[PDB]
Amino acid sequence: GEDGIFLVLLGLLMALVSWSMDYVSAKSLQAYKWSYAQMQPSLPLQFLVWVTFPLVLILFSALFCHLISPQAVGSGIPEMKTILRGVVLKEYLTMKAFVAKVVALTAGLGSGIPVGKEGPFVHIASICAAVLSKFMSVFYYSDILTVGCAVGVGCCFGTPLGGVLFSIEVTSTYFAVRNYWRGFFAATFSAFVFRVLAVWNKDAVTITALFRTNFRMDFPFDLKELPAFAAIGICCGLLGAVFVYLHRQVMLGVRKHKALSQFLAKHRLLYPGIVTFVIASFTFPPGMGQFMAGELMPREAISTLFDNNTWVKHAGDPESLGQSAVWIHPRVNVVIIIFLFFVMKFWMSIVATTMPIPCGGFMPVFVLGAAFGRLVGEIMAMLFPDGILFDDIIYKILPGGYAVIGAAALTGAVSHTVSTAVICFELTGQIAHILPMMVAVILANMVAQSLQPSLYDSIIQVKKLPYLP
Amino acid sequence: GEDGIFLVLLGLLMALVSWSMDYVSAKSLQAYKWSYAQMQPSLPLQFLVWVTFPLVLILFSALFCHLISPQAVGSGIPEMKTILRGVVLKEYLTMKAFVAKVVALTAGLGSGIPVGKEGPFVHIASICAAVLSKFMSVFYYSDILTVGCAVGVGCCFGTPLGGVLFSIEVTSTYFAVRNYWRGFFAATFSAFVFRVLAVWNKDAVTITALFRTNFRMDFPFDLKELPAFAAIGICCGLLGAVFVYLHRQVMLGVRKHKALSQFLAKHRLLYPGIVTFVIASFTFPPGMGQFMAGELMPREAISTLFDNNTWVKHAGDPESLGQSAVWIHPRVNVVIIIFLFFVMKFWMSIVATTMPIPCGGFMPVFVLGAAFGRLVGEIMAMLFPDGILFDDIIYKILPGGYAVIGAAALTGAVSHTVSTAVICFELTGQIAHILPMMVAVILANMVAQSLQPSLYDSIIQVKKLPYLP
């Protein structure tokens, strides 16, 4: 009927918005790197620019989520999964919030602070679905929200079927397969237009997925290492649980005492600002980024962590690798700097997503999972030096695969879902490690579902929304 | 709770059954090839053995679906998708049919006649689910059938998430996500045990998917060829529709007249037997297999059609390729033999799946799709000789990708579903062509949903089961 025209118009209007915002964010971020390099090597000057650019940009984003729309702070998927369980929120789906959010999500992304991308984008995709429906036939409600969620995540990442699985498996109890067909149609069209546009205007020469990895697909892994994958199941789930626990121990920590509540009511934007300050103090590269690999914005950080070469063995030479040359210090072994990167981005991510900013809880958790995966992969490669044999040719293990297993498993354990593995392999561009990441996702899910509740369940519990089951 | 023990026991019991039956079928089929080669080149003797082995084995399978269980003929998914819409069939889920079906599906598969594998396997997986539940807690119903369907197709092909999508998207109207989690768990465990067992006992050296393809993943296809994919959408959908139409024009063709009904009631097993005969008459390789590539059992036939080299250009030399050397005739161009293979397996497949045998409608449709795909790929490679340029290196197109697009799209158009692309790329082992196969699956679905009904809908219409919507 007249469903196809509405769905194709939603897809073509969502791809341009996603492409525009990350185009602008990428140009702002490379201008940041450019100016920071190109002034001079002056260590106080480097500190002051490396601090004053993210404070300006994050306080700008907090200003445009405070001023225009007072209801879009703390946004993302948990209040809309509260909405589709029956509760209506009338003023919350206003078009005026839309322009109030997108520009904030630009200025949440153009800095190197770990935030999400998915959550506010799911919200604005639902906004565009509702507005385009209300404009339609003036010249069904949970259907509109489910199609909005599918188009939102499948237009974030160019991952259609991971989009429709992410819409069904957490934001529902029953599900009409009419929405399955509609969400699959609109999500694959949005992911189609978003990827071909980066060949038209910019240069990404073909319809490569987003983050390709050149693994070898000829004996990737034997079953002599397979219980190691069991470890990267279980520990990730355990680590995922601790994340959720500590998240609540900051949320209530904002609201536990009258003193800091009076301090925040004295001036609202002071809480993001200074804490932006302190994580800039641990990201300055000659300050502590030597011990940290601090000079990595997160997109190229996880393009780096999915590399196809062993970092312990290429440390005997000063050979120029890609960006991964920042992962070599002349005094410290690389296992220690992966360890410190993991622990400091781990406590940095919770306090980064705590602040009153449009936040998603997917991307920094994905980065933490990749870091833990490559940690256990590098100690596997250090433990078994020779590799094993094949027809007069030697195959040695490679730790990019461990990184992609961990970057599926830990965010699957945090967000209490099994469909994270789908967008994981659909971002990485290869499915060589597919059933080990499914087994690891399921082990991490059963451990992190035994111990603690989900992330979004804790958010709706602390924010105290009407949530009946 | 006590769900995990039941699901892991179902998975480990289903993997052994699938592995055992295709182990036995593969050994029988290679013994067929072995004896046929190893007697002598005597052209009447070759004819008589090439005919008398499939007649014996197919009449044996028809005997063991006629004798023990009189209710398991015409089995597969459409009567069970009738069952889960409300209608009960009491005597149909008896354990006695289980042993009556599995051995038949061995002797439906050990011959080279095109049959399915999925349908009767979904049925026996539901049988094992129900029996293991009734044995459980003596020392929920649609849940048991949906878990049975997911384990069935994900244990056929080692494809978990394509399994759970194949269970939701056609055999439901609503869907409880409890069954999503259970089906995902049990399907990935079944696909895990099935693939690692082929390294323990037999040799498939690692957890390679099933049918790997070595494409190049470095500029697979430009967007200068992309409307060709539009053609392999639309035509496949049109061709898929014709398949369904002709299928009904044989089913009613059995039941249109009293004469052939009296002829069949005279002797029931005569109808499969002789028609097995006639397709053997068009598969004898010096008879007509020169013009046909007849000496290809279907599994190695579609391992051949997914090859990474151009068949027009490697015809100037008598170089030994793999099995694909059967695709070269010294007098006939290869486009004509792909064309004749397609048209003769097209009319052969409907009459092959017509006969009273446990049949699935997935595998021969998959083969027909691969043949049409490589047809349009070879004429694309014949049309554009030079390829195009890159950094002083030339990239020419390769027609394996067209074959895998067509083998997704035409069976997606026949079975009226979008989740065929998932098991397509999960069998082929690479996701380089993923969003073109999604776009082609959706174009073929909208054309073949405009023209004719589904395959299984026509089956339940002609068999006249109680089907309310």
Residue numbers in the entry:
A (entry chain A), B (entry chain B): 115 to 253, 262 to 591
Paper lines:
The first identified human member, ClC-1, is essential for maintaining the permeability of Cl− across the plasma membrane of skeletal muscle fibers, gCl, accounting for approximately 80% of the resting membrane conductance and assuring precise neuronal control of muscle contraction. Despite distinct roles as passively conducting Cl− channels and stoichiometrically coupled secondary active Cl−/H+ antiporters, members of the CLC family share a common homodimeric core architecture, with each subunit harboring an independent ion translocation pathway. In addition, the complex gating processes that regulate CLC channel activity remain elusive, with only a single available structure of a channel member, namely, that of bovine ClC-K. Each CLC monomer has a gate that operates independently from the other (also known as “protopore” or “fast gate”), structurally attributed to a specific glutamate, “GluGATE”. Here, we have determined structures of full-length human ClC-1 using single-particle cryo-electron microscopy (cryo-EM), exploiting a purified protein sample that displays Cl−-dependent single-channel–derived ion conductance.
Three-dimensional (3D) classification of particles resulted in several different groups, of which one yielded a 3.6 Å overall resolution density map for the transmembrane domain, allowing confident model building. The final model represents the membrane-spanning portion (note that the N terminus and intracellular αA helix are lacking) as well as parts of two C terminal’s so-called cystathionine-β-synthase (CBS) domains present per monomer (for which some cryo-EM density is left unmodeled) and includes several features that were not observed in the ClC-K structure. Unfortunately, the GluGATE side chain is not visible in our cryo-EM density maps, but carboxylate groups of interacting acidic residues are known to be frequently undetectable using cryo-EM due to radiation damage. The pore aperture of the extracellular vestibule is constricted by a hydrophobic barrier with Met485 (Met427 in ClC-K), but in contrast to ClC-K, the gate opening is also controlled by Lys231 (of αE–F) and Arg421 (of αL) that may orchestrate Cl− permeation to or from the extracellular environment.
